[PDB]
Amino acid sequence: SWLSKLLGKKEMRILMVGLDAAGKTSILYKLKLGEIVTTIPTIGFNVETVEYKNISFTVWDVGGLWRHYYQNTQAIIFVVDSNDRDRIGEAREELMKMLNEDEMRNAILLVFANKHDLPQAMSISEVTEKLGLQTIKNRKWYCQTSCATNGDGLYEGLDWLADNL
Amino acid sequence: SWLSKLLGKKEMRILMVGLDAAGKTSILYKLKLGEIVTTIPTIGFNVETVEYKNISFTVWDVGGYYQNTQAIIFVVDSNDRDRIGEAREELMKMLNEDEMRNAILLVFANKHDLPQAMSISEVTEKLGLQTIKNRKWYCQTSCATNGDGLYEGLDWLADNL
Ligand SMILES: Nc1nc2c(ncn2[C@@H]2O[C@H](COP(=O)(O)OP(=O)(O)O)[C@@H](O)[C@H]2O)c(=O)[nH]1
Ligand SMILES: Nc1nc2c(ncn2[C@@H]2O[C@H](COP(=O)(O)OP(=O)(O)O)[C@@H](O)[C@H]2O)c(=O)[nH]1
Ligand SMILES: [Mg+2]
Ligand SMILES: [Mg+2]
Secondary structure (H helix, E strand, O other): OOHHHHHOOOOEEEEEEEEOOOOOOHHHHHHOOOOOOEEEOOOEEEEEEEEOOOEEEEEOOOOOOHHHHOOOOOEEEEEEEEOOHHHHHHHHHHHHHHHHHHHHHOEEEEEEEEEEOOOOOOHHHHHHHHHHHHHHOOEEEEEOOOOOOOOOOOHHHHHHHHOOO | OHHHHHHHOOOEEEEEEOOOOOOOHHHHHOOOOOOOEEEEEEOOOEEEEEOOOEEEEEEEEEEOOOEEEEEEEEEOOOHHHHHHHHHHHHHHHOOOOOHHHOEEEHHHHHHHOOOOOHHHHHHHOOOOOOOOOOOOEEEEEEOOOOOOOHHHHHHHHHHOO
């Protein structure tokens, strides 16, 4: 479904970021679009890439030069650990910094509220409020619950992304 | 060349482990042997792999694939005094595994560039390396940022297989 709408001749660049241990690597792997490749453009800055035909997913941790990899980004996936209540405030701050980058002003926002399987995970209502998504103007956004370990939620989120480019 | 020595017909499997943040991914990237590929064979277990001709490096974090292993590289953060005991415990666990009794051991005392780093004698001591019998081992200081020490360590590894 989403695969159909994303594939083509023109490069499709997706940025997936979030705090460490949000589940970003696990998501890449569960997509099955090919090998996860790690590069280190500078020491301490680990970048994971999955490239399949015209589609690129670029992943790194935030909250710890970036502007280079923002070129022609069409979507931001922001992954959050729904169970990490102590760092939701940090996640909000890193998301808002991303959303103030002019280079990516026309990128749509998909938020995965990940680790939905966990007994004290925040609800999608809670994650949406605490990330301040309602405050977003002139950008399409969606927040989608996910479990990156069984893959629940991932295709639903990507389907929305593909439909709204 | 440490590379030319490892090269040949016979498979050469190296296992590189250590605590998270020890410097293992950085070391792999510095080796320039090929793309680093991540797999997740089981939930929560991230494995990085570099394969070049007959040589494969397999990397994962311990703390917090043993068949035909010719060498173990253990990477320790020389500047992390609070966790070196944990590094010792995980190293000793691995060296007790039957499947790998025949593997030689290279220890990289990494992050040697940092001004407060433990000296090699102290790393050696706090890892209990001297207590290891019936295994060839070597401790080498390294800096993964600029490659200091890496070639020296790998050359010892290639020589002593
Ligand atoms: N329970 C649960 N654990 C998850 C989920 N997604 C990721 N994890 C675990 O959280 C840890 C961090 O995952 P990882 O993908 O490496 O996060 P990254 O640092 O953002 O790339 C790993 O142990 C994962 O197995 C999830 O949806 N549910
Ligand atoms: N100062 C210094 N920092 C290092 C060295 N090796 C790695 N690092 C840093 O330590 C952090 C963790 O290294 P990484 O390769 O990701 O460790 P891994 O978790 O064992 O794969 C990164 O911020 C690196 O920049 C080193 O030799 N010296
Ligand atoms: Mg990751
Ligand atoms: Mg690593």
